[PDB]
Amino acid sequence: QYNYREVLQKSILFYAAQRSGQLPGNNPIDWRDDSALDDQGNGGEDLTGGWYDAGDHVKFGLPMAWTATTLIWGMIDLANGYGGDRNDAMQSVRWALDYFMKCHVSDNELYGQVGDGHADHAYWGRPEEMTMDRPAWSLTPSAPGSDLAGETAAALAAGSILFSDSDASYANQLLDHARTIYDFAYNNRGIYSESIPNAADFYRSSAYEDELCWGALWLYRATGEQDYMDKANEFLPQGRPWAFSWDSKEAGSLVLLTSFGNSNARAQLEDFLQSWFPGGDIHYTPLGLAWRDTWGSLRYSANSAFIALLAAEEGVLTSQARTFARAQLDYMLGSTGRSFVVGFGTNPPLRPHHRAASCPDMPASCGWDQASDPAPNPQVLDGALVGGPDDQDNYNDDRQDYISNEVACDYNAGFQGALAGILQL
Ligand SMILES: OC[C@H]1O[C@@H](O[C@H]2[C@H](O)[C@@H](O)[C@H](O)O[C@@H]2CO)[C@H](O)[C@@H](O)[C@@H]1O
Ligand SMILES: [Ca+2]
Ligand code: NA
Ligand code: NA
Ligand code: NA
């Protein structure tokens, strides 16, 4: 009934529209061009590239790295669902991985943010036309961040697995960085949003030990080296994960641990999933969305859908998990009578909260008037999953409602993999 493949193809285009830096010649987004070409570290290190996080122009390293790891995971384990779109998806995520390698300026220094979130948000306009100072902040032993660094290692290690067959030299570059960055994370303990306090209003980290587990598991998967499993076993998930997201890795670790034969983790994964199924502990809206929170409700559901599909591949609650994942993705695509995916389906959102998509065609000026205009965005941000409805299915397609209507890297990450998973059924 729904064209899941069309949505997956559009999701890849969303990531293309989030690119910072010197865009590739094959750039498919005609309203995006080169931008942030002076992004640099405090020693002059090149920090160009990466993805803008949301409807803004900050490069936030924790969600950017989680997005990459999560996207990569689906390309590894749901490869058949990706099908003829896998190579496109793989090329897309290189944008993030290459940036992470640039951020890793020396063994024990990792850039974790470029842009001041408050200053960035005070601008409305095209990223190509920014003129404000864009500070860069790094993690070091005296300013640690085991969470951001652990996630960055996870993404690189997952990348090494994905790219091993097609591009061994690239895989070996990724793994070398992943090892060194994980050592940094493990040997220098702290919350990155304490070390980079600008991030504490945007991507406040609740804990880092879940990233230490997650990163170790991915390095175990990438290397086969028992010491990484021993490290993962120091940080095993405790209790039921609240959700899977850029902040909490536990549900993801539960799937990986289950895949490696951890019996406790398999039971914990069952307990997580059953809560999200109908008649569990997660609120259901009347129209069938498994609703976790006010902000990014569709993201949280899609992230659980992705975990459910992966868990089903491990034989965990298999049919019910697949039924759940389909119900949630169908809510996103159209089951309520409208789409929540920009540029897709029936009555999609027209005014997602996104600076560049809000701007008219070049060469017209773009500024704060574009933020509040009741007209549709002039550019269509194809593929973006919006924040989504409240607990009673109410949703406003209002550009200024950045709870209902923002879009973000992390929002699309679980979603894109879930689409691949459904395409294998
Ligand atoms: O929990 C947030 C907020 O909810 C308010 O109720 C909302 C309900 O969440 C929403 O889905 C429905 O469409 O509108 C109502 C009324 O705004 C609630 O009244 C607040 O007390 C609460 O903080
Ligand atoms: Ca965490
Ligand atoms: Na504290
Ligand atoms: Na817990
Ligand atoms: Na219940």
Ligand code: NA
């Ligand atoms: Na079942």
